[PDB]
Amino acid sequence: GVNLEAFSQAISAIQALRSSVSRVFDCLKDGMRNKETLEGREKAFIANFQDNLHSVNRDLNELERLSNLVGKPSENHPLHNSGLLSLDPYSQLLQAYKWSNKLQYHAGLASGLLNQQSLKRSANPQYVDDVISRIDRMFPEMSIHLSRPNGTSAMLLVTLGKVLKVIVVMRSLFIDRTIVKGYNTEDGKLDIWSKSSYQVFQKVTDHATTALLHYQLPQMPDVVVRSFMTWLRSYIKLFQAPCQRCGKFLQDGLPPTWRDFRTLEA
Amino acid sequence: EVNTATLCRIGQETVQDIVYRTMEIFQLLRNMQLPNGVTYHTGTYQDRLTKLQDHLRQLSILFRKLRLVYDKCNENCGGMDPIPVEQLIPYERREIVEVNKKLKQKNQQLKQIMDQLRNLIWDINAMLAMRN
Amino acid sequence: IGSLSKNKLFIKLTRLPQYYIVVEMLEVPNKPTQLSYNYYFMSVSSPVMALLLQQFKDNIQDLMSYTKTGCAFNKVLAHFVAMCDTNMPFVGLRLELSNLEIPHQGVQVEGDGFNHAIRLLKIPPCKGISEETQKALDRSLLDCTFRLQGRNNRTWVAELVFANCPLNGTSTREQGPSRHVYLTYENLLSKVVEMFLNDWSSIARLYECVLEFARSLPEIPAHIFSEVRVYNYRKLILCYGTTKGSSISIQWNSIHQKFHIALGTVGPNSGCSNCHNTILHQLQEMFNKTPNVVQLLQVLFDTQAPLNAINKLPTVPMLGLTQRTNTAYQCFSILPQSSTHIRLAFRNMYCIDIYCRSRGVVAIRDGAYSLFDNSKLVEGFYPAPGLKTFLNMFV
Amino acid sequence: AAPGAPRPSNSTLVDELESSFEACFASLVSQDYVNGTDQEEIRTGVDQCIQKFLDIARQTECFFLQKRLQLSVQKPDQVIKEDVSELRSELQRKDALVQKHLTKLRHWQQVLEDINVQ
Amino acid sequence: INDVYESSVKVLITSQGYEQICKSIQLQLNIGVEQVRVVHRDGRVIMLSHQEQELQDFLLSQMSQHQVHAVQQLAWQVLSFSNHVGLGPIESIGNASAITVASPSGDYAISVRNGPESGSKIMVQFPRNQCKDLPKSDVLQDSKWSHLRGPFKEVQWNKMEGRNFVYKMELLMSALS
Amino acid sequence: DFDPVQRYKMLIPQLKESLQTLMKVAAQNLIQNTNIDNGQKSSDAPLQRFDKCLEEFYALCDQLELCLRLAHECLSQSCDSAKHSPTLVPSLPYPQYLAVIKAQITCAKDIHTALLDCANKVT
Amino acid sequence: QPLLDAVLANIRSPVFNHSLYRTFVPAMMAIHGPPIVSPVVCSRKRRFEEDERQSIPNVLQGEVARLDPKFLVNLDPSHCSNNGTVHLICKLDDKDLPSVPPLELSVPADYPAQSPMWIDRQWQYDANPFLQSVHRCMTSRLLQLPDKHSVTALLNTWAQSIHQACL
């Protein structure tokens, strides 16, 4: 429901229109303080009209208009007002909603800025792994599956849009030893280790290994595998290469910083 | 039984643990959704409630120990109180050194033992490479 | 003019400003070995811009090696490549910065830094109040410095310091002179000087604003006094609730020449939200009229009680089902159209308007009269709230 | 007295850490009504609280390090005893790991003999 | 998962008692087909020789530099102006392995020049208020500045209370009491 | 029964035209005042009140602002209800929903009291 | 659209900018009631006394404060007080071999010039053959310096030429 942001923007716009009206009528209530060469400050008056032209910005709200026109009479809210009149203590529900949203955003910002850790070091479960894999499989166009043909370690494969499927061996976490193979795969009777490529997919595997060694966290493997899955899914397009042309080399793929760009650019 | 340098190191580790526990309590507060959302009615709810209860009790004990070690460091100012070597930073012990040497020798022996063990482990991994 | 040999370019340094090339000096007399790796250098910018410059020290590079404390030939090729790799960004910065002032290049960091650095002198004035703010600024100004930060690809950091700053910030261990100032920049295609000078102009405006604070407030210091918070380029103050609460901030926006303000949320004995944002917009426009921050502070001290009090009542809820329709209405519609004059209504009906101006004087009026009741009405909210006069005169 | 150049102040850096910690938490819960509206007003407070928290933690760690250096250069016997205790702990951990590995190896020997028994 | 022809090992710096110093992690996939290809943090596909191992020492030096940078970020806030090697202080002894980590923390500033035998223990640290200077054209000079951090005051990194190279914060702590 | 979007759509042109009319009458009053004061009397005609114009302008502005704020509040309420409760209403048993809301309120109050006791112990 | 107020402000030529007061402020103070929008006292003296009056232009001061401590600058006979503002009498007191102090007299801070002037050089350079080679190298380097600067560029080039032309 991003229309709330649009309505807040419209409120800010109309408040700015009122403020600009007040400001221009106040400026008209004063003359040239000290010009001594030309009363060019009257041009600021015209500039004030530009702020009044910002009223047309409120007309932009007509594009954001038609945000809500439905039934759903306030979404299951009325309990005491439209219900038991004696049930007056209702608003506690809305208070709790606001409290929870505030706590959520507060803790989110706190965790986001707490990246500057201060802990030096630490000095003085296959079912869980399969469950984490299945939970990560919950994203669209990211059909993954595992079989564990050899060993107690995890053998996971991912196929997003093309025949560029990737295999990643895990040890219940921090899945290292990545191998991407475009257009064949599981030869013999299980996953293979051919690692054949077109001198570019091998580079992609190198990038994946670099990320795995880079996105390795000291604990909490959930966030680790989540960042891993997002980093891999970011390859769904492979069609744009900023900071250079589209043919800087054999192929231009390296989104390590949440944005794809031309390869060989570190 | 002075253990003063170890006490200062323990205080540093304790404030580091306080910071890490602050990070942890924030990371566990951010994922505290509505009770009757889907299924976490009271089980995981009360579970994380008791978890944060233990967190705050441990943090209070840690603050107690921090106050105690700070008071101990303050009262430790006995003899050579000024000690101006802070701004003047530069620019028997035999028995302890011998015990350290013997410990390092035993450690080198155990290191060779671990080297043999990991060689055998790599060999076993090689065998498994031959497996079907 | 060279023999058959390979060459190289850069990526982390730049796209291709200087081709790196070496030729194997063959036909060595009395020795079938020791090609000596005759180095060269190209300034190609697309035809190759042939600027050889004959820049090479071989084989006297061994002399430079013996001058210091010190099996491939890394010890010389590494030097000959890294010197240009770390020089090209600095010479490009100097070329682009020669427009402003003092593009002197090469001043090493005390020699023992072994790192390039570009010091500046007399940054040009800004479009701000150059009458007296520029004067005291350059009186307190010190040299700025550019260095190469980041992962050596594209990142320029700037360190700035001044003399004894007037905004004496406490609770931050401010040094004798101005503590520090740091600015990061990372262009995508290389205009960084433009953002740099914009930042400097913002610094000048905020420095003028802070200099305007050098006075004595009548009663504000009683509300101990906590307005000297950490100050580098964003002022912060808290003279509310007898504690460090509602800390109004002061910063700058590059897109629009207007300033920006925001109250603080830290404080034990403060309100939960405690956000005067409901009126902030209004007052922020006021700040664009009079930049004297003491006036903003005083009007905030005035509006402290009325704002918080009028926000204490519930206003967000929609009263559930309406009085006689299926719709709903807000519990109390509030709108502070101005600094202190606000408008309060119930269910979009029977608006009132209370506003505090003097030390304690808060006047109330009916907002449906339009300063002439006998003439007409406001064509809107229903008038006649009732005997509000005596209702308030009760107390 | 606060805005000027001098600033006499004491009684900090001990409980001030807990003060700064508890600072950006009463805004969450207090005996006051919480308005059901907020938009980036909390970030302006939490950023300041967090940076002050990091600053005071660094101050405390610097004080501890200063006391460490003073007592080390004054009396290194504490450092020697600390190194001795660290060596003892390392030896104990090594012995425990060796015992666990030996138990695992003996169990594996037993189960291997059982499997070879057929 | 040791395959029929190749394997791999993950290696890291692992400073003495510092889990936050994880600034480089080298994954080496060794195989008899060709030279081993190793990637630490940059995707720099490399290939050594049968008896070439100095790349490990070069990574060691440059990661020691990155580690002192990160721990300086841990304790003032000296920015990232510390690069790998600027023009070469010690003639690049040790296969281009030259470290030069600068760090202006506060009123002081510390600059270390490490490297693979290219003077590994070369560190200086200069404060603002010094003793030897030239007050001829400076004392009578207007605006008497406390920012004259002229002399180097070489740290002389010998007999310093550092366990293994990892206590640059230990000397940075002696900057604000 | 008018809608918030409908009332906004019908108020915007009234607001614009009222702005135009008030600006025109303000310009007329200004030129009349100048002609009577600076120069000779030429505008021999009575002007308008000029106060009702901007007064009703600000009135309609306040009306628009508060109705848009009410609409925003309604959307926020719907969003928070959908987030804190599943979409089920007459489907879900109403007494069970009331009990679930009461338990949610009690749980939030307990979390708040725990954090408050934590802050007090920090003191 | 409302250009009427624009043409009216254009009409506002006469000096009596007080009719607009009676025209606008009644309703303004009626509907808006901030009679004291800034009750804070504002009385500060703009210019009482602010001048150095005791040294050279501080621009060169801030410049020379950055140079390496191996450069020792002194004060010559008083002929570069204010306009010339610079008598760069420097000594390269360091681990390298010493030499003759340079002159390097720059110009007013506007910098439509540089420092090198070399007055006392006529006999200081031609006497010693090695110092003559040093002077030749320094001249060749300075001529290749596009728009050298006051203290940094000149002294840096001089030092590098002195310690490069050793041979």
Curated annotation (Swiss-Prot), chain B:
Pfam families: Med30. Keywords: Acetylation, Activator, Coiled coil, Nucleus, Transcription, Transcription regulation. Residues 92-127 form a coiled coil. One of its GO terms (molecular function) is ubiquitin protein ligase activity. It is found in: Nucleus. Belongs to the Mediator complex subunit 30 family. This is Mediator of RNA polymerase II transcription subunit 30. It comes from Mus musculus. The lineage of its organism: Eukaryota, Metazoa, Chordata, Craniata, Vertebrata.
Curated annotation (Swiss-Prot), chain D:
The keyword Transcription applies. One of its GO terms (cellular component) is nucleoplasm. Keywords: Actin-binding, Activator, Coiled coil, Cytoplasm, Membrane, Nucleus, Transcription, Transcription regulation. GO terms for biological process: negative regulation of smooth muscle cell differentiation; positive regulation of transcription elongation by RNA polymerase II; positive regulation of transcription initiation by RNA polymerase II; RNA polymerase II preinitiation complex assembly; somatic stem cell population maintenance. GO terms for molecular function: actin binding. The keyword DNA repair does not apply. It is found in: Nucleus; Cytoplasm; Membrane. Residues 78-114 form a coiled coil. Component of the Mediator complex, which is composed of MED1, MED4, MED6, MED7, MED8, MED9, MED10, MED11, MED12, MED13, MED13L, MED14, MED15, MED16, MED17, MED18, MED19, MED20, MED21, MED22, MED23, MED24, MED25, MED26, MED27, MED29, MED30, MED31, CCNC, CDK8 and CDC2L6/CDK11. The MED12, MED13, CCNC and CDK8 subunits form a distinct module termed the CDK8 module. Mediator containing the CDK8 module is less active than Mediator lacking this module in supporting transcriptional activation. Belongs to the Mediator complex subunit 28 family. This is Mediator of RNA polymerase II transcription subunit 28. It comes from Mus musculus. The chain holds residues 32 to 149 of 178 of the full protein.
Swiss-Prot record, chain E:
It comes from the Eukaryota. Disulfide bonds: none annotated. It is found in: Nucleus. Component of the Mediator complex, a coactivator involved in the regulated transcription of nearly all RNA polymerase II-dependent genes. Mediator functions as a bridge to convey information from gene-specific regulatory proteins to the basal RNA polymerase II transcription machinery. Mediator is recruited to promoters by direct interactions with regulatory proteins and serves as a scaffold for the assembly of a functional preinitiation complex with RNA polymerase II and the general transcription factors. Component of the Mediator complex, which is composed of MED1, MED4, MED6, MED7, MED8, MED9, MED10, MED11, MED12, MED13, MED13L, MED14, MED15, MED16, MED17, MED18, MED19, MED20, MED21, MED22, MED23, MED24, MED25, MED26, MED27, MED29, MED30, MED31, CCNC, CDK8 and CDC2L6/CDK11. The MED12, MED13, CCNC and CDK8 subunits form a distinct module termed the CDK8 module. Mediator containing the CDK8 module is less active than Mediator lacking this module in supporting transcriptional activation. It comes from Mus musculus. Belongs to the Mediator complex subunit 17 family. The lineage of its organism: Eukaryota, Metazoa, Chordata, Craniata, Vertebrata. This is Mediator of RNA polymerase II transcription subunit 17.
Swiss-Prot record, chain F:
One of its GO terms (biological process) is positive regulation of transcription elongation by RNA polymerase II. GO terms for cellular component: core mediator complex; mediator complex; nucleoplasm; nucleus. Its main location: nucleus. It is found in: Nucleus. Keywords: Acetylation, Activator, Nucleus, Transcription, Transcription regulation. Component of the Mediator complex, which is composed of MED1, MED4, MED6, MED7, MED8, MED9, MED10, MED11, MED12, MED13, MED13L, MED14, MED15, MED16, MED17, MED18, MED19, MED20, MED21, MED22, MED23, MED24, MED25, MED26, MED27, MED29, MED30, MED31, CCNC, CDK8 and CDC2L6/CDK11. The MED12, MED13, CCNC and CDK8 subunits form a distinct module termed the CDK8 module. Mediator containing the CDK8 module is less active than Mediator lacking this module in supporting transcriptional activation. Belongs to the Mediator complex subunit 29 family. This is Mediator of RNA polymerase II transcription subunit 29. It comes from Mus musculus (Mouse). The lineage of its organism: Eukaryota, Metazoa, Chordata, Craniata, Vertebrata. The chain holds residues 52 to 185 of 199 of the full protein.
